[PDB]
Amino acid sequence: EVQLLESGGGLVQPGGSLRLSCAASGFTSSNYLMSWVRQAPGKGLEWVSSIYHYGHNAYYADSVKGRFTISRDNSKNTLYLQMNSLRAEDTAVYYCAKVDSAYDFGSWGQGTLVTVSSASTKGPSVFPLAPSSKSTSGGTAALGCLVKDYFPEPVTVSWNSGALTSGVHTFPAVLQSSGLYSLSSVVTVPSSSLGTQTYICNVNHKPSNTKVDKKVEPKSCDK
Amino acid sequence: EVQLLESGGGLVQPGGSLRLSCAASGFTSSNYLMSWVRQAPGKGLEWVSSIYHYGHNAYYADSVKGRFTISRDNSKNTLYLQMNSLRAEDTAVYYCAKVDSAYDFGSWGQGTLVTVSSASTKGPSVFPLAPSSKSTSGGTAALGCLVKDYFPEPVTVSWNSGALTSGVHTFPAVLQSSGLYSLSSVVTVPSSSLGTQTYICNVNHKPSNTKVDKKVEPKSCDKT
Amino acid sequence: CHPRLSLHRPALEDLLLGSEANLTCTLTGVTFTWTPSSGKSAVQGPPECGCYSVSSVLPGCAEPWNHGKTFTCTAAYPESKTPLTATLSKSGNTFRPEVHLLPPPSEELALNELVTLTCLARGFSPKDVLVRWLQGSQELPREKYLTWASRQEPSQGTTTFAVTSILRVAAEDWKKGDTFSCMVGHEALPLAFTQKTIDRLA
Amino acid sequence: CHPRLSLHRPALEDLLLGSEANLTCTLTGDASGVTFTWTPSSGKSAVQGPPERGCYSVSSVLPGCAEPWNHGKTFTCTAAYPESKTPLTATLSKSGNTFRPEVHLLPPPSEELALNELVTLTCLARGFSPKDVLVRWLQGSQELPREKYLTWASRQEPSQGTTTFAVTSILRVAAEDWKKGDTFSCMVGHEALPLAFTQKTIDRLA
Amino acid sequence: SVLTQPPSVSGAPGQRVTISCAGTSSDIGGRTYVSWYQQLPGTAPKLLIYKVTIRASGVPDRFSGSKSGTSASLAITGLQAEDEADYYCASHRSNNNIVFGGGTKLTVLGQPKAAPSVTLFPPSSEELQANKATLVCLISDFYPGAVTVAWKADSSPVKAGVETTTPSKQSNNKYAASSYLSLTPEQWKSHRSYSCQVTHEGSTVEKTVAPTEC
Amino acid sequence: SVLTQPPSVSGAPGQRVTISCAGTSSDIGGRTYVSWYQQLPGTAPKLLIYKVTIRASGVPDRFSGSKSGTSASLAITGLQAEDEADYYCASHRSNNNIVFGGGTKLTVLGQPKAAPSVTLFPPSSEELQANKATLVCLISDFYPGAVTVAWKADSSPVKAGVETTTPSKQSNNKYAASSYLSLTPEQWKSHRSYSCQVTHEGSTVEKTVAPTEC
Ligand SMILES: [Mg+2]
Ligand SMILES: [Mg+2]
Ligand SMILES: [Mg+2]
């Protein structure tokens, strides 16, 4: 199966430079037209750069010309976008995409968020949202993780290293008056299984290189 | 040297056919653009047909399209013009020509006269025009041949098989009231040499396949 | 080395001109005999990998070749006891070449130095093909143009061949309105050659 | 016959992609009691093969030669063979006096378009000094497999001056596809190109 | 520039709806290199149609594309709530760009009212030990995507230290929103209870936490 | 069609003269394949100029060629009596035709008057033995090219049986003509003499032949 993993996203100061990487798997990125496509939060898709088959013949959007450079490294099978003289308007999720037969983006990566801002990077504080006291009935219980006071976006939350997905809901972050984001991830689980089952949230904030595992146990007043 | 010899010209009845040949030498006629160019008596040059290098890719003047065919036998190194459904206005001298670098006729043959007419082919009577008995020591004497009552044109005249040329003057043919042509060929020579030198006119009328040689002696009343 | 015998066609050059053509018989690895020879005086030469090679020609066999008559050449040589056999006749399932003379690209004309004329003969069944050029009514020498080898083209259907040829000319000559012609010689052409002529006025 | 030795350059495909390239040596013109030696790369597992055929020949390869080759360093391959006492010598480096290919993609002629069956696109790569060239084709953003087009071998051009080469390639495509406005590209790979390949893209609209 | 799409189209379930894409002679006009992408909320775009008319594998026949001169249009039949997404056309342009449209938000009408599920978490022992306190009010599975959140300390309303999100589309077409009440530990401790009240289409859901309970 | 040349051009010795050749866009216009030929009387055409400007082998630089749009010009400086000839332009047309012009007669003015050389031959014995009889009056090396021929039997004019040629251009720019008197042998024998009188620009040259004298 074709796979594209973007990395490199995070905070950069206006006028700063960033490098995005894009690792290809299950195809050879040299043998295809490869592209970067960007989407500012809330807004539309904008094609950024293409690099044609085999060679280093690149094309660029005029919004990006004389600043960005699309590279390819065949030994690693990775695509690059070198970004220079970055501005507020370059804040976006950057997708790498494999073009098929007809200038069509057949395969997309998950995307990487570049934030251009004068603000400072701040790592999140993770807190357990402990489940309710009633731990013996036919009904469910909500427990979660509070990921408090980080910048910039984004944060990813998984439960038990991705093993737990059923009843998982990671809420979109609030932007607070302080300019820092907070978010919450909640999981609905059986009440009877609260003492037995281990529930660990895996919080990743790549821009601050903060990876936290937090175990969510029932309350000290629970029996 | 490049040389081109046209043959096949002569009388042909209106509607009749006639094949002209062109013997090339000192070049390979296949390796060049080769053309037929015709000129009606008195009137201008008219390009007729071309055949491009090596192949049978031919082009024709619209005056001649459908009727004439240009061909080239490489083993004989000769060019041909097949002419069918012939008309009065096809009467002309027909030259073959080697085209050089720039659609330019660089080499021409002597031409062959095709005459399209309802009339009949008639060969000439050749008579000697004997020189004067006048002694005139140091002076010249005129003698000639009378080529009488032939059709069609042309008649050619050489003297001593082309060896004698100085003093030679072959006159354009008269067209008589009968519809037959007559011409004369005269040569100016020394008076002193008349008894000693042999003067033979060689008359060719190719249309009638008539080749006559006539010795031109002084008069029976003459003493040297 | 294995004893092997093979026949070679007559020169297309000779056949298309309509003159005498030599059919050649060689033992790549002595006296030969020919089936279709009816008083045709065969001629040998000095024998020269450089590992055991002899040749014998047979002249004046243009007429039977074009008729499609089959040629046999058997060779009695002193190394073995019995002879070898090789069969060759003029090829069937012929297709006439499709010829195209393509004008110079816009890129070269702008630079006003040499410009490139491209002759493409395409779709012809026997590989054997002659390519020749005119500028005006002048044939250009062989060494003033580049002709590629005749190569089999792709298809699921019939076997056809293509060849390309490339003539460089001064942009001056092209802009004067001089004619340029590519002439393609081939067995299946009823007029022996096909001519395509090009200039700035098309 | 007279024993001869020559080195063979690395694959243009491998060098142009920027991956590891095999440098090969062969012995033309006796049993294979043979030992090869290489100069520029010392103790780098110089691999051998079986004696392939008339008289046999032993093939020796050397991996990871890309950076020194492209740097222009000279490779020597001395080969000891039992038939003689002393060995043979063969030298090979990356070629000098390089020239970039001029690439021209020519549209299909009026003749073919009118017949409205298959039409022919002609890629001409011209004026390049090392003979070695890659030619590949796109329809749209799709690369066509080798089997769908015909490429001739690189041959020396006429010149009293500098020694250049030219190659041609021919892609036959449906009249329909050409008339819809589909793009067709030929990509030319060559050592002297600063971006490895040069691409020319033609459509009916220009 | 940008290929011109309508900012939104809407339809009833089972309806046929069309999304137009107006380009130029340098892109959609004369060529057939027009592609359509579906973008569900959160996720990356997915190719539906390429080469004007050709469905990608998995895409149902309900989806179809067409071209006429300088504009193309996506067409959806048997319209389902599942089809609610942003739709982008793209096209190859003469300048070797790939040009996207502005995008079209597709709405499916007549979806039933769904009441918000409200979960209220008090401040964790761990947060209190860091001299901080947050009440997390999580609101999910409501339609349509509009709620008002009021906070209470005992019976007294609170507006200070409230940060509420705009509702965002879930994968199941219903909406999620969170609300956070910042207190000091001392504030949290010195009140009998705090409440999060979620009002949705004139019906309120109240959750209450106290420092002296579980 | 035919390329348009002037039917006649005239010039004085030593002067410059030009012969125009008006063609079209299909032939002379936007091409350089214009050639010029010289035709002397009773001889095949000879290439003078090819490729508009290029002078054939042996052709003196007195001859020059030029082109302007859809018409070409042959130019002759230091004009001489031996330049008197018919001149044809030709061009390659787009048909793959070669198109000739109508031809131009070049006359050179102020050439001196030359009196005709006259030779009268009586009937040959051979002709009389065949029961025919022809008097042959040969007229050469005269300029300009006009003569009247009168025949006499004794003192009496004869006009019946007279066949006279129109004067024709010799290789040396002077003119030749012949006149023939058809008689019967019996007519020939039964007069004292016959005369051929050639009047040229008001000067008559009389030659006389008798059956009796030698
Ligand atoms: Mg036969
Ligand atoms: Mg209070
Ligand atoms: Mg009388």
PDB file of N, CA and C in Angstrom, chain B residues 37 39 43-45 47 52 59 95 101-105 108-109 127-130 133 142-143 146 148 169 171-177 183-184 186 219 221, chain F residues 33 35 37 39 44-45 47 50-51 88 92 95-98 100 119 121-122 124 126-127 132 134 136 138-140 163 165 168 170 176-178 180 214:
ATOM      1  N   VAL B  37      11.883  20.120 -71.941  1.00  0.00           N
ATOM      2  CA  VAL B  37      11.498  21.542 -72.188  1.00  0.00           C
ATOM      3  C   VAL B  37      11.303  21.687 -73.695  1.00  0.00           C
ATOM      4  N   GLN B  39       9.836  24.043 -77.233  1.00  0.00           N
ATOM      5  CA  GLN B  39       9.789  25.410 -77.808  1.00  0.00           C
ATOM      6  C   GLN B  39       9.219  25.316 -79.224  1.00  0.00           C
ATOM      7  N   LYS B  43       7.935  30.766 -81.112  1.00  0.00           N
ATOM      8  CA  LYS B  43       7.340  31.067 -79.776  1.00  0.00           C
ATOM      9  C   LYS B  43       8.368  30.764 -78.670  1.00  0.00           C
ATOM     10  N   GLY B  44       7.943  30.737 -77.399  1.00  0.00           N
ATOM     11  CA  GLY B  44       8.837  30.723 -76.221  1.00  0.00           C
ATOM     12  C   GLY B  44       9.105  29.329 -75.668  1.00  0.00           C
ATOM     13  N   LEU B  45      10.022  29.241 -74.697  1.00  0.00           N
ATOM     14  CA  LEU B  45      10.331  28.005 -73.928  1.00  0.00           C
ATOM     15  C   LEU B  45       9.117  27.647 -73.065  1.00  0.00           C
ATOM     16  N   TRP B  47       8.375  24.558 -70.260  1.00  0.00           N
ATOM     17  CA  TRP B  47       8.634  23.355 -69.432  1.00  0.00           C
ATOM     18  C   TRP B  47       7.461  22.385 -69.612  1.00  0.00           C
ATOM     19  N   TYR B  52      12.060  13.422 -60.753  1.00  0.00           N
ATOM     20  CA  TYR B  52      12.972  13.697 -59.612  1.00  0.00           C
ATOM     21  C   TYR B  52      13.963  12.539 -59.486  1.00  0.00           C
ATOM     22  N   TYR B  59       6.371  15.118 -62.610  1.00  0.00           N
ATOM     23  CA  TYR B  59       5.483  16.305 -62.663  1.00  0.00           C
ATOM     24  C   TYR B  59       5.352  16.749 -64.121  1.00  0.00           C
ATOM     25  N   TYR B  95      13.670  19.588 -76.025  1.00  0.00           N
ATOM     26  CA  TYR B  95      14.985  19.400 -75.361  1.00  0.00           C
ATOM     27  C   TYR B  95      14.788  18.571 -74.090  1.00  0.00           C
ATOM     28  N   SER B 101      21.618  22.552 -59.027  1.00  0.00           N
ATOM     29  CA  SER B 101      21.447  22.679 -57.557  1.00  0.00           C
ATOM     30  C   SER B 101      20.180  23.464 -57.188  1.00  0.00           C
ATOM     31  N   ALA B 102      19.611  24.243 -58.119  1.00  0.00           N
ATOM     32  CA  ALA B 102      18.652  25.337 -57.826  1.00  0.00           C
ATOM     33  C   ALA B 102      17.529  25.415 -58.871  1.00  0.00           C
ATOM     34  N   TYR B 103      16.993  24.274 -59.310  1.00  0.00           N
ATOM     35  CA  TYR B 103      15.926  24.191 -60.347  1.00  0.00           C
ATOM     36  C   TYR B 103      16.365  24.978 -61.597  1.00  0.00           C
ATOM     37  N   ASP B 104      17.640  24.824 -61.964  1.00  0.00           N
ATOM     38  CA  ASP B 104      18.322  25.536 -63.074  1.00  0.00           C
ATOM     39  C   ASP B 104      18.744  24.496 -64.122  1.00  0.00           C
ATOM     40  N   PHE B 105      18.334  24.695 -65.375  1.00  0.00           N
ATOM     41  CA  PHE B 105      18.708  23.832 -66.526  1.00  0.00           C
ATOM     42  C   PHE B 105      20.154  24.145 -66.927  1.00  0.00           C
ATOM     43  N   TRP B 108      21.780  21.195 -71.583  1.00  0.00           N
ATOM     44  CA  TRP B 108      20.705  21.002 -72.591  1.00  0.00           C
ATOM     45  C   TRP B 108      21.228  20.101 -73.707  1.00  0.00           C
ATOM     46  N   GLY B 109      20.346  19.337 -74.353  1.00  0.00           N
ATOM     47  CA  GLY B 109      20.659  18.642 -75.614  1.00  0.00           C
ATOM     48  C   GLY B 109      20.472  19.567 -76.805  1.00  0.00           C
ATOM     49  N   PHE B 127      20.935  17.844-104.832  1.00  0.00           N
ATOM     50  CA  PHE B 127      21.624  18.213-106.096  1.00  0.00           C
ATOM     51  C   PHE B 127      22.876  19.016-105.762  1.00  0.00           C
ATOM     52  N   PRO B 128      23.997  18.816-106.497  1.00  0.00           N
ATOM     53  CA  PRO B 128      25.191  19.630-106.304  1.00  0.00           C
ATOM     54  C   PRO B 128      24.984  21.026-106.899  1.00  0.00           C
ATOM     55  N   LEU B 129      25.374  22.059-106.152  1.00  0.00           N
ATOM     56  CA  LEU B 129      25.527  23.447-106.655  1.00  0.00           C
ATOM     57  C   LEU B 129      27.007  23.645-106.981  1.00  0.00           C
ATOM     58  N   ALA B 130      27.372  23.449-108.255  1.00  0.00           N
ATOM     59  CA  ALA B 130      28.771  23.355-108.731  1.00  0.00           C
ATOM     60  C   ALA B 130      29.435  24.729-108.679  1.00  0.00           C
ATOM     61  N   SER B 133      33.522  28.493-112.976  1.00  0.00           N
ATOM     62  CA  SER B 133      34.724  28.148-113.786  1.00  0.00           C
ATOM     63  C   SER B 133      35.777  29.266-113.712  1.00  0.00           C
ATOM     64  N   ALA B 142      32.402  29.707-104.542  1.00  0.00           N
ATOM     65  CA  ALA B 142      31.190  29.221-103.846  1.00  0.00           C
ATOM     66  C   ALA B 142      30.725  27.927-104.515  1.00  0.00           C
ATOM     67  N   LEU B 143      30.516  26.886-103.714  1.00  0.00           N
ATOM     68  CA  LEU B 143      29.856  25.621-104.120  1.00  0.00           C
ATOM     69  C   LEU B 143      28.931  25.204-102.977  1.00  0.00           C
ATOM     70  N   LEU B 146      21.850  21.566-102.877  1.00  0.00           N
ATOM     71  CA  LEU B 146      20.410  21.923-102.890  1.00  0.00           C
ATOM     72  C   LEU B 146      19.621  20.726-102.363  1.00  0.00           C
ATOM     73  N   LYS B 148      16.123  19.509-101.771  1.00  0.00           N
ATOM     74  CA  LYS B 148      14.868  19.959-102.434  1.00  0.00           C
ATOM     75  C   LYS B 148      13.696  19.049-102.034  1.00  0.00           C
ATOM     76  N   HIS B 169      27.968  27.681 -94.633  1.00  0.00           N
ATOM     77  CA  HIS B 169      26.730  28.443 -94.330  1.00  0.00           C
ATOM     78  C   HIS B 169      25.531  27.646 -94.848  1.00  0.00           C
ATOM     79  N   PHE B 171      21.553  27.563 -94.979  1.00  0.00           N
ATOM     80  CA  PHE B 171      20.503  28.609 -94.944  1.00  0.00           C
ATOM     81  C   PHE B 171      19.229  28.016 -94.358  1.00  0.00           C
ATOM     82  N   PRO B 172      18.424  28.798 -93.601  1.00  0.00           N
ATOM     83  CA  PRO B 172      17.077  28.369 -93.228  1.00  0.00           C
ATOM     84  C   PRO B 172      16.245  27.956 -94.450  1.00  0.00           C
ATOM     85  N   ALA B 173      15.434  26.915 -94.279  1.00  0.00           N
ATOM     86  CA  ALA B 173      14.598  26.315 -95.342  1.00  0.00           C
ATOM     87  C   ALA B 173      13.525  27.316 -95.777  1.00  0.00           C
ATOM     88  N   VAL B 174      13.235  27.345 -97.076  1.00  0.00           N
ATOM     89  CA  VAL B 174      12.025  28.000 -97.644  1.00  0.00           C
ATOM     90  C   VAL B 174      10.880  26.992 -97.525  1.00  0.00           C
ATOM     91  N   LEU B 175       9.711  27.438 -97.063  1.00  0.00           N
ATOM     92  CA  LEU B 175       8.432  26.691 -97.202  1.00  0.00           C
ATOM     93  C   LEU B 175       7.782  27.125 -98.516  1.00  0.00           C
ATOM     94  N   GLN B 176       7.698  26.209 -99.476  1.00  0.00           N
ATOM     95  CA  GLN B 176       7.186  26.484-100.842  1.00  0.00           C
ATOM     96  C   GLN B 176       5.653  26.407-100.818  1.00  0.00           C
ATOM     97  N   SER B 177       5.016  26.840-101.909  1.00  0.00           N
ATOM     98  CA  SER B 177       3.543  26.832-102.121  1.00  0.00           C
ATOM     99  C   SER B 177       2.995  25.399-102.075  1.00  0.00           C
ATOM    100  N   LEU B 183      16.056  23.673 -98.791  1.00  0.00           N
ATOM    101  CA  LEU B 183      17.167  24.556 -98.344  1.00  0.00           C
ATOM    102  C   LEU B 183      18.387  24.336 -99.233  1.00  0.00           C
ATOM    103  N   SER B 184      19.389  25.185 -99.023  1.00  0.00           N
ATOM    104  CA  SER B 184      20.738  25.091 -99.627  1.00  0.00           C
ATOM    105  C   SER B 184      21.780  25.243 -98.518  1.00  0.00           C
ATOM    106  N   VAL B 186      25.898  26.208 -98.625  1.00  0.00           N
ATOM    107  CA  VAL B 186      27.014  26.716 -99.475  1.00  0.00           C
ATOM    108  C   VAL B 186      28.295  26.721 -98.632  1.00  0.00           C
ATOM    109  N   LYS B 219      32.370  22.071-112.989  1.00  0.00           N
ATOM    110  CA  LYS B 219      31.459  21.936-114.158  1.00  0.00           C
ATOM    111  C   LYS B 219      32.195  21.185-115.280  1.00  0.00           C
ATOM    112  N   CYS B 221      32.213  21.924-118.398  1.00  0.00           N
ATOM    113  CA  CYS B 221      32.795  22.990-119.263  1.00  0.00           C
ATOM    114  C   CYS B 221      34.105  23.548-118.670  1.00  0.00           C
TER     115      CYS B 221
ATOM    116  N   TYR F  33      14.926  30.637 -56.377  1.00  0.00           N
ATOM    117  CA  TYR F  33      15.147  29.618 -57.439  1.00  0.00           C
ATOM    118  C   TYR F  33      14.802  30.218 -58.805  1.00  0.00           C
ATOM    119  N   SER F  35      16.251  31.579 -62.425  1.00  0.00           N
ATOM    120  CA  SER F  35      17.382  31.371 -63.365  1.00  0.00           C
ATOM    121  C   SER F  35      17.139  32.171 -64.648  1.00  0.00           C
ATOM    122  N   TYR F  37      18.372  32.433 -68.895  1.00  0.00           N
ATOM    123  CA  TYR F  37      18.946  31.701 -70.053  1.00  0.00           C
ATOM    124  C   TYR F  37      19.153  32.678 -71.210  1.00  0.00           C
ATOM    125  N   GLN F  39      19.419  32.525 -75.389  1.00  0.00           N
ATOM    126  CA  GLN F  39      19.195  31.746 -76.635  1.00  0.00           C
ATOM    127  C   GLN F  39      19.621  32.595 -77.837  1.00  0.00           C
ATOM    128  N   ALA F  44      20.356  25.904 -78.729  1.00  0.00           N
ATOM    129  CA  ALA F  44      19.684  25.576 -77.449  1.00  0.00           C
ATOM    130  C   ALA F  44      19.934  26.698 -76.441  1.00  0.00           C
ATOM    131  N   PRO F  45      19.033  26.920 -75.451  1.00  0.00           N
ATOM    132  CA  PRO F  45      19.281  27.885 -74.381  1.00  0.00           C
ATOM    133  C   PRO F  45      20.540  27.549 -73.571  1.00  0.00           C
ATOM    134  N   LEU F  47      22.262  28.550 -69.734  1.00  0.00           N
ATOM    135  CA  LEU F  47      22.107  29.145 -68.383  1.00  0.00           C
ATOM    136  C   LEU F  47      23.141  30.265 -68.223  1.00  0.00           C
ATOM    137  N   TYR F  50      21.796  31.493 -62.145  1.00  0.00           N
ATOM    138  CA  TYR F  50      20.925  30.655 -61.281  1.00  0.00           C
ATOM    139  C   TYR F  50      20.953  31.233 -59.862  1.00  0.00           C
ATOM    140  N   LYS F  51      19.986  30.842 -59.028  1.00  0.00           N
ATOM    141  CA  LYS F  51      19.888  31.241 -57.595  1.00  0.00           C
ATOM    142  C   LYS F  51      19.809  32.774 -57.499  1.00  0.00           C
ATOM    143  N   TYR F  88      15.394  34.397 -71.489  1.00  0.00           N
ATOM    144  CA  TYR F  88      14.288  33.825 -70.678  1.00  0.00           C
ATOM    145  C   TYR F  88      14.714  33.777 -69.211  1.00  0.00           C
ATOM    146  N   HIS F  92      11.153  28.010 -60.164  1.00  0.00           N
ATOM    147  CA  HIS F  92      10.392  26.939 -59.470  1.00  0.00           C
ATOM    148  C   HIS F  92       9.099  27.543 -58.907  1.00  0.00           C
ATOM    149  N   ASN F  95       3.802  24.261 -57.400  1.00  0.00           N
ATOM    150  CA  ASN F  95       3.272  23.049 -58.088  1.00  0.00           C
ATOM    151  C   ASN F  95       4.306  21.909 -58.135  1.00  0.00           C
ATOM    152  N   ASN F  96       5.604  22.220 -57.987  1.00  0.00           N
ATOM    153  CA  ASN F  96       6.761  21.445 -58.516  1.00  0.00           C
ATOM    154  C   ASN F  96       6.740  21.552 -60.048  1.00  0.00           C
ATOM    155  N   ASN F  97       6.296  22.706 -60.555  1.00  0.00           N
ATOM    156  CA  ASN F  97       6.472  23.165 -61.954  1.00  0.00           C
ATOM    157  C   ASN F  97       7.735  24.021 -62.012  1.00  0.00           C
ATOM    158  N   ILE F  98       8.362  24.097 -63.183  1.00  0.00           N
ATOM    159  CA  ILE F  98       9.350  25.163 -63.519  1.00  0.00           C
ATOM    160  C   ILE F  98       8.665  26.054 -64.554  1.00  0.00           C
ATOM    161  N   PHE F 100       8.596  29.310 -67.073  1.00  0.00           N
ATOM    162  CA  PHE F 100       9.410  30.208 -67.938  1.00  0.00           C
ATOM    163  C   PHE F 100       8.662  31.531 -68.122  1.00  0.00           C
ATOM    164  N   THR F 119      25.003  35.222-104.231  1.00  0.00           N
ATOM    165  CA  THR F 119      25.499  34.097-105.070  1.00  0.00           C
ATOM    166  C   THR F 119      24.302  33.476-105.794  1.00  0.00           C
ATOM    167  N   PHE F 121      23.121  30.442-108.353  1.00  0.00           N
ATOM    168  CA  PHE F 121      23.447  29.102-108.909  1.00  0.00           C
ATOM    169  C   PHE F 121      22.412  28.745-109.967  1.00  0.00           C
ATOM    170  N   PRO F 122      22.834  28.289-111.169  1.00  0.00           N
ATOM    171  CA  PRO F 122      21.901  27.813-112.186  1.00  0.00           C
ATOM    172  C   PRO F 122      21.493  26.377-111.870  1.00  0.00           C
ATOM    173  N   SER F 124      21.419  22.454-111.737  1.00  0.00           N
ATOM    174  CA  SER F 124      22.441  21.389-111.897  1.00  0.00           C
ATOM    175  C   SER F 124      22.036  20.481-113.062  1.00  0.00           C
ATOM    176  N   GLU F 126      22.219  17.350-112.911  1.00  0.00           N
ATOM    177  CA  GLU F 126      21.532  16.265-112.158  1.00  0.00           C
ATOM    178  C   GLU F 126      20.029  16.576-112.085  1.00  0.00           C
ATOM    179  N   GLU F 127      19.670  17.823-111.754  1.00  0.00           N
ATOM    180  CA  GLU F 127      18.261  18.290-111.610  1.00  0.00           C
ATOM    181  C   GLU F 127      17.570  18.312-112.980  1.00  0.00           C
ATOM    182  N   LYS F 132      13.479  18.739-113.784  1.00  0.00           N
ATOM    183  CA  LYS F 132      13.196  19.911-112.917  1.00  0.00           C
ATOM    184  C   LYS F 132      14.305  20.940-113.145  1.00  0.00           C
ATOM    185  N   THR F 134      15.908  24.581-110.861  1.00  0.00           N
ATOM    186  CA  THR F 134      15.864  25.558-109.743  1.00  0.00           C
ATOM    187  C   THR F 134      17.083  26.475-109.842  1.00  0.00           C
ATOM    188  N   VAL F 136      19.064  29.201-107.620  1.00  0.00           N
ATOM    189  CA  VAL F 136      19.243  29.379-106.152  1.00  0.00           C
ATOM    190  C   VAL F 136      20.037  30.669-105.938  1.00  0.00           C
ATOM    191  N   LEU F 138      21.401  33.082-103.048  1.00  0.00           N
ATOM    192  CA  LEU F 138      21.807  33.006-101.622  1.00  0.00           C
ATOM    193  C   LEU F 138      22.337  34.374-101.193  1.00  0.00           C
ATOM    194  N   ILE F 139      21.714  34.944-100.160  1.00  0.00           N
ATOM    195  CA  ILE F 139      21.899  36.346 -99.696  1.00  0.00           C
ATOM    196  C   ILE F 139      22.328  36.286 -98.229  1.00  0.00           C
ATOM    197  N   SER F 140      23.534  36.764 -97.921  1.00  0.00           N
ATOM    198  CA  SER F 140      24.167  36.657 -96.584  1.00  0.00           C
ATOM    199  C   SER F 140      24.831  37.976 -96.182  1.00  0.00           C
ATOM    200  N   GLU F 163      10.058  31.697-104.616  1.00  0.00           N
ATOM    201  CA  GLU F 163       9.884  31.401-103.172  1.00  0.00           C
ATOM    202  C   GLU F 163      11.053  32.072-102.440  1.00  0.00           C
ATOM    203  N   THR F 165      12.603  33.473 -98.613  1.00  0.00           N
ATOM    204  CA  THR F 165      12.561  33.358 -97.135  1.00  0.00           C
ATOM    205  C   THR F 165      12.536  34.758 -96.517  1.00  0.00           C
ATOM    206  N   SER F 168      16.754  36.079 -91.678  1.00  0.00           N
ATOM    207  CA  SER F 168      17.007  35.361 -90.406  1.00  0.00           C
ATOM    208  C   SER F 168      18.392  35.737 -89.882  1.00  0.00           C
ATOM    209  N   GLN F 170      21.994  35.668 -88.467  1.00  0.00           N
ATOM    210  CA  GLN F 170      23.231  34.840 -88.504  1.00  0.00           C
ATOM    211  C   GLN F 170      23.924  34.886 -87.133  1.00  0.00           C
ATOM    212  N   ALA F 176      20.741  36.495 -93.106  1.00  0.00           N
ATOM    213  CA  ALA F 176      20.763  35.616 -94.295  1.00  0.00           C
ATOM    214  C   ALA F 176      19.336  35.452 -94.820  1.00  0.00           C
ATOM    215  N   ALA F 177      19.197  35.315 -96.138  1.00  0.00           N
ATOM    216  CA  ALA F 177      17.957  34.880 -96.817  1.00  0.00           C
ATOM    217  C   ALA F 177      18.310  34.212 -98.144  1.00  0.00           C
ATOM    218  N   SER F 178      17.393  33.392 -98.647  1.00  0.00           N
ATOM    219  CA  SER F 178      17.525  32.655 -99.926  1.00  0.00           C
ATOM    220  C   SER F 178      16.283  32.919-100.778  1.00  0.00           C
ATOM    221  N   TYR F 180      14.462  31.290-104.638  1.00  0.00           N
ATOM    222  CA  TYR F 180      14.462  30.135-105.568  1.00  0.00           C
ATOM    223  C   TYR F 180      13.516  30.441-106.731  1.00  0.00           C
ATOM    224  N   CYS F 214      29.531  29.440-119.323  1.00  0.00           N
ATOM    225  CA  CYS F 214      30.142  28.657-118.214  1.00  0.00           C
ATOM    226  C   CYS F 214      30.879  29.614-117.268  1.00  0.00           C
TER     227      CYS F 214
END
